[PDB]
Symmetry: D2
Subunit: 264 residues, 4 copies
């Protein structure tokens, strides 16, 4: 009766389906997969990448960046929603091959430094290669690259370092406020009385209100289905996309129902 | 045509077969599995653990330590042969649950800090939870716990930070010199002209001579089969065990044959 | 006209005046200096140290711990108020010589990992040897050592990771609720519109209310003068000590006056 | 009788005397001070900086890089001789302000990660802000930036991670082999029987032979006086410069004399 073997982190095949760069605004591009968002913001002084997806997506990301005329040495900054394997997986490999830096808050940095191990809910089940953060950012801090300002909005819940990023881009001259809001889900979490996260419910509640008040004309999420995006229908991907209010209100309804079922 | 899924690190079932603590000397015990060595040295001022095996062995290690009258808070120091998943796997979990410290050289420390990721030969294929080293030790440095001196002997090759540990114990009063020598294998390595390890062959050659000159009456290895140990036959486990000269000489014969076949 | 020389971190001589262990409760002791608090909590399963003072106090701390019958290997856990040189200075040296672990939140951990460098207000002016945290704790998390529960209460302001610790001890059988509240000062900080700390005022306001609602019968602070302690008059040190309400209310009056003067 | 105050790291005024960029080859420049070497190698795909000097030199380095038409975002890689405060001081500040990466061996990385604290000989007396290495390099490894190959040559002694860098540049078309060899001194070290460095003498001896066999037409050192450079007389700075053989032979004569005097 030997000990169990190690189990790999397996995801749906749609999370790993490569796609060509889909344009979101004049400078913003989706270069991830069909069910995983990886945003590229091209500026005059370099490129900014938000999230990266699964650890085995680093090659596909460099391929799409090459398609957009972005050399590896042109990636300046990597920003993250939260440091889980399905969103910050290839961060370590992308740092070695691009010369980019990583900016994240303290909670995302310490989780990223241990490769997502010792998770508050998942333990060591979802482990990815570790990476270090080069710049620690605070709530409301502005990160500027090539004349584009990225404002961080802390929204703890899914992870203690969950962060929504807001920036203003154009769409044929007309400005558009983009809000890349992190996930507001809690799959299988113990919500009430968690010894590892004593103030989990209070953080989620404050994060719901944080998402509602985000300056947003167009909303994106790490998982495109969370905001009703569909990267498969390229030009009509943002057809039935939710607002910031509709996204936070829908997430809280599932949170209260899950919280009430946990008490039973 | 989606990207490939992540693949888990799977080993032979004999590597994960738990075993009761097998005694090696008056203070040294084997508390790992049948095919993975994990040594416990009980002193008057605490316990010392050398290696830990696979990442899913932390519970079994604490079980055997409990059998030897060693509380979790009694583990003082964790020493390592080399920082691969099949030998330093549970180091991170053991640090959280025992209050122990880790002593290793700089090369083992940096590899352990990134959880074995970005390996010089294996890449990210063999990843385990990361852990940090608390004390950096040099070649020939002595680590003393409870009146027992542990001397480090650098033997780079399998990893840049491969280390053999020598200490003197007793066997019913009579002293015995124990040498825990690291692995001298190179499974599937590119030996000649490796860009990641330009001086690999020269390090192996110097390590062969380092193992031959080790003060040793009884030899152990991370994999017991490498030194002809058989943990299954408890009392007769050290029956046909190799000397330090026979172990290094046998490893070099396989190295030259592998090196010559690589040139063809 | 050469560049300026490096300037050392110099403090008042009263901050470095060694003192004998002054008892606070049945298990709590002050073993720091006259103007720097360093608390030792002796339990049945080991000792807990809160803060350490200046970096050159590690020897004095080990001397006082020896006076209390606490061996170096008996220090199990180091807790911190905030990671500045005058309170977490000797943490690195104490870890090497005691085999203890450090528990702190993510913000204190990342600041401690870079030795207090790149401070949000002080820059590199107050640098101390770096140390790594072994356990990351959340707001409201309980840390138990030897049957004594230490509850963390986040109170950001002086530093992003400022933490107040509450635990219940006895005084000749009768229980006493002790609250070790961090500093609520802001010496020379830019309060409004700080690019490195955009939500500084809002964090201070929430920290004032956090301190008022602390379960507390006896209050201590990293600097004893902040809570009207006087370690010099040993038995009557806690004579005119402030409550939690009086301490937070007095700190906010100075914060509003400083905030109003900054606007002028 | 209070504890002693912290003492700052003070150096000679000539170590902090700023100087204009002095040219060494077609792509190599000295942009440090008169008595501290900081080399800038301008390539078509970015700039490479070797060492930085004292921690308070980051501003002067960026000033000279601006004079050479090198923007902060054009610094790609920082290489180091050894990680002491007088040579890797501003590395942390330069990483925050340039977007560059650091490549160093494991021994230099772990020393740089703790800001030079816990030195094998100096203790905590020479502390500088900590920085992390992004790429770990081995002995003989080649680092290529903009078509220029930088080969690492390990020469342990002054520090365990001391490294000499060799690269080929031109001087009006004609190629020149440049060897930036680390310091071979040992000021006040205990050479024989050092518990922190048991194989110190053997490392120095092997480093002497490593320096003699360096491919070198022009030799530079972290301290220019060690190789008889004089940055003050700009055009004639390399007048009486030593060869690699003359530098290693002169260093070993002082090592044997110091070693013999230590035995007395
Ligand atoms: C770690 O990755 C996740 N979890 C899993 O894949 C497994 C472990 C699972 O929850 O069944 C995780 O969190 N995600 C999110 C999110 O919204 O962020 C959702 C909705 C679920 O998928 C990913
Ligand atoms: C990473 O673990 C090892 N490698 C593997 O498990 C796979 C990847 C394999 O080599 O086929 C590794 O190294 N070991 C040793 C050793 O002697 O250390 C030997 C002999 C082979 O097994 C383990
Ligand atoms: C970094 O140490 C401090 N600052 C200084 O020593 C200098 C830099 C200064 O502020 O003039 C700091 O913060 N302290 C506190 C506190 O309340 O924590 C107070 C009240 C002032 O003293 C220490
Ligand atoms: C830490 O910096 C050094 N040491 C000092 O400044 C003091 C502590 C001193 O040794 O008196 C150090 O090493 N250097 C070297 C070198 O060759 O690297 C030499 C020759 C001496 O100066 C610097
Ligand atoms: Zn997630
Ligand atoms: Zn997810
Ligand atoms: Zn191995
Ligand atoms: Zn192995
Ligand atoms: Zn402070
Ligand atoms: Zn203070
Ligand atoms: Zn030096
Ligand atoms: Zn020097």
């Amino acid at each position: 009766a030997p000990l169990p073997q190690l189990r790999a982190y397996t995801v749906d095949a749609s999370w790993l389906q490569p796609m060509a760069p889909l344009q979101v605004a004049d400078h913003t591009w989706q270069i991830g997969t069909e069910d995983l968002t990886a945003l590229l913001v091209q500026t005059a002084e370099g490129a900014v990448l938000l999230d990266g997806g699964m650890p085995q997506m680093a090659g596909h990301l460099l391929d799409n960046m090459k398609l957009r005329g972005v050399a590896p040495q042109d990636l300046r900054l990597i920003l993250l929603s939260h440091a889980h394997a399905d969103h910050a997986g290839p961060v370590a490999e992308l740092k070695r091959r691009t010369g980019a830096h990583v900016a994240a808050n303290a909670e995302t940095a310490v989780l990223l430094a241990r490769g997502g191990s010792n998770d508050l809910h998942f333990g060591d089940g979802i482990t990815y290669p570790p990476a270090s953060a080069d710049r620690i950012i605070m709530d409301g801090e502005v990160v500027t690259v090539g004349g584009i300002a990225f404002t961080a909005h802390f929204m703890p819940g899914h992870t203690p370092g969950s962060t929504a990023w807001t920036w203003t881009d154009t769409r044929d001259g007309k400005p558009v406020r983009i809000a890349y809001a992190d996930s507001l889900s809690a799959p299988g979490y113990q919500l009430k009385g968690n010894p590892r996260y004593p103030r989990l419910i209070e953080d989620y509640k404050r994060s719901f209100a944080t998402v509602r008040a985000l300056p947003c004309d167009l909303l994106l999420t790490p998982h495109p289905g969370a905001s009703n995006w569909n990267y498969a229908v390229g030009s009509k991907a943002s057809a039935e996309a939710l607002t910031c209010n509709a996204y936070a209100d829908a997430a809280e309804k599932k949170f209260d129902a899950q919280l009430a079922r946990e008490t039973a």
